[PDB]
Amino acid sequence: KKKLGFFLVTFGFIWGMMLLHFTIQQRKK
């Protein structure tokens, strides 16, 4: 759970980076 724990934190960041591009995709189409 030591390594997996730190990796699990990054997983959440993904939802944020993809949510950003999602807003732009709407602009284009």
Swiss-Prot record:
Transmembrane segments: 4-20
Effect noted on mutating H21A: No effect on the biosynthesis of the secreted form
Location of the protein in the cell: Golgi apparatus membrane
Modification comment: N-glycosylated. A secreted form is released from the membrane after cleavage by gamma-secretase.
Reported induction: Induced by IFNG treatment in monocytes (in vitro).
Family statement: Belongs to the glycosyltransferase 18 family.
Function: Catalyzes the addition of N-acetylglucosamine (GlcNAc) in beta 1-6 linkage to the alpha-linked mannose of biantennary N-linked oligosaccharides. Catalyzes an important step in the biosynthesis of branched, complex-type N-glycans, such as those found on EGFR, TGFR (TGF-beta receptor) and CDH2. Via its role in the biosynthesis of complex N-glycans, plays an important role in the activation of cellular signaling pathways, reorganization of the actin cytoskeleton, cell-cell adhesion and cell migration.
Stated name of the protein: Alpha-1,6-mannosylglycoprotein 6-beta-N-acetylglucosaminyltransferase A
The species this protein was found in: Homo sapiens
Organism phylogeny: Eukaryota, Metazoa, Chordata, Craniata, Vertebrata
Residues of the full protein shown: 13 to 37 of 741
